[PDB]
């Protein structure tokens, strides 16, 4: 429930890992000649960045996993129909369908385990850095509850990355890294602390916490990683059992040639082609491909209660039963059954900055709250002069106040702040998909072309795939038609 400083919403959501081979985000290596304070800040920043990345892609996209089931059913049914039309044996029909599931599951699982492996490899690289600098304690980077490294040998890591073989459905083996951590004491000591886990299971936990705590940030949470793992197992079990029930009831009665899907462009295929040539943001194209109810016809101007930030953009609900999002109404996403996704241009982000001191003493402007990353505070003085200050230029006083010296920017250095507002630092139109976590109010709902002001929202999605549906050509024709006109609406 933590994202862009300006919006409680989890930002930079990447759902592409459920539809394509996803490349992991690499580790940042700090310099040799560094100060303990600088190393601690750089390590804390890397942990925050890694957790934020993992939240947006794997960890916080739980309610879109029913879409993975939909994608897996589409792909397997097409493979099965081709075999049924060829007058093949029931085993050959199921073989083609399950080979499609095997390749799809391998991709989804490999992407998921690859991101865990990178998180765990990064921690080791960060641990090795702390060991080498010798000005920072291991208790800073590896804290599992009892970070007492008094009996651990010099130049030795308390971590061990164990190779664990995962049997991928396509017959191949994948090396999943099992994270083991031992503080160094003997079994018998009261201080003895050991943890060993991965997204699949907790091997051993002694005087330990699965998750790591670095500068107050809890990450590598087994409960978070295992939640996605157990849901992934559920989804692919349901597809395989469902396709078995489907073929058993469809074999013989559905005539060979009744359904012709050989040239069909699947919602998954449609979204992957968007990557080659992008006419819209990838995440909304992916959410459409996963059959998540979206509102393409309207444009909502939202305002965040706590922040004051206003944004125009398009909505997406994982559960359409979360009711219509009416204009003039205030909504708290913590109460909702599903997850709210908002796709909007970050450059347009704007809101009032009331947390500012009146006095401009010797050109110095002081603010009473942390400036938001990727935004600039536009300070207007009583002499009708304005100065744009990006967050990175605000110096922390450690008093809960931040200051900037505008002696080179203002004509009158000694003055009073008239008003202040925060605006985005983005040079161009930059689209982003956020998962709204904090309370928001829907200001206005603008129709897509005409510009009319509507009261409520209307979400649309194609027929969800079951173990007994997509028997008629009409069901399949509607799938391609409904999807291609949704993509057109965002272009
Ligand atoms: Br330094
Ligand atoms: Br597909
Ligand atoms: Br066919
Ligand atoms: Br890997
Ligand atoms: Br330390
Ligand atoms: Br120690
Ligand atoms: Br050990
Ligand atoms: Br000991
Ligand atoms: Br994480
Ligand atoms: Br946990
Ligand atoms: Br048949
Ligand atoms: Br819907
Ligand atoms: Br669905």
Residue numbers in the entry: 8 to 498
Mind quoting what the paper says about this structure?
Haloarchaeal pleomorphic viruses (HRPVs) infect archaeal hosts living in hypersaline environments. The virions contain two major protein species, a spike protein (VP4 and VP4-like proteins) protruding from the membrane surface and a smaller membrane associated protein (VP3 and VP3-like proteins) residing mostly inside the virion. Here we describe crystallographic structures of VP4-like spike proteins from two pleolipoviruses, HRPV-2 and HRPV-6, showing that these proteins have a unique fold, different from class I–III fusion proteins. VP5 is thus a bona fide fusion protein.
In order to characterize the VP4-like fusion proteins (termed VP5 in these viruses) from HRPV-2 and HRPV-6, we purified them from infection-competent virions using either detergent (HRPV-2) or protease digestion (HRPV-6). After protein purification, we determined the structures of the HRPV-2 and HRPV-6 VP5 ectodomains (residues 1-498 out of 533 residues and 9-498 out of 537 residues) at 2.5 and 2.7 Å resolution, respectively, by X-ray crystallography. The two proteins, which are 67% identical in amino acid sequence, share a highly conserved V-shaped fold (r.m.s.d. for 453 corresponding Cα atoms: 1.6 Å). Surprisingly, the entire C-terminal domain is disordered in one of the two molecules of the asymmetric unit of HRPV-6 VP5. Although there is space in the crystal lattice to accommodate this disordered domain, the bulk of adjacent molecules prevents it from adopting the same orientation with respect to the N-terminal domain seen in the other copies of VP5. It appears that the N- and C-terminal domains can flex with respect to each other in the face of crystal packing forces. Analysis of proteinase K treated HRPV-6 particles by LC-MS/MS resulted in the identification of several peptides with core sequence FGVPGEVAV representing part of the predicted C-terminal transmembrane domain. The first twenty N-terminal residues of both VP5s are hydrophobic and predicted, by several programs for analysing hydrophobic regions of proteins, to form a transmembrane helix, indicating the preference of this region to partition into membranes. Interestingly, this hydrophobic segment is shielded from the solvent in both crystal structures by the C-terminal domain. HRPV-2 and HRPV-6 VP5 proteins share an average 67% amino acid sequence identity with the N2 subdomain being the least conserved between the two spike proteins.
